[PDB]
Design a protein around this ligand. Sequence first.
Ligand code: NA
Ligand code: NA
Length: 101
Amino acid sequence: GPMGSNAVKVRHILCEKHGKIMEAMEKLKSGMRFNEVAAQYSEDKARQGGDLGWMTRGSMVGPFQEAAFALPVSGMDKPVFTDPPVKTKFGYHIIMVEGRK
Ligand code: NA
Ligand code: NA
């Protein structure tokens, strides 16, 4: 149905360990740009600055999807990200959304 046409352009920092995702969160809260935090800490898409690109509804793991569609579009100078980090079967994610359909 129509909700399957919904999508987000999404960027994340993924860390297996809670301690490490919290380190990443401290860097974001210090002002570090999201892509730079992802380069330092993310275990997925690190070389893309955490960018997952466009992801349609149904393509993301449940807790990640619910968190992502709840975030407004933001940019890396004025980010709006998940706090606290979101736990999935992959680990802990910090997410921001750069586009919405
Ligand atoms: Na842990
Ligand atoms: Na999960």
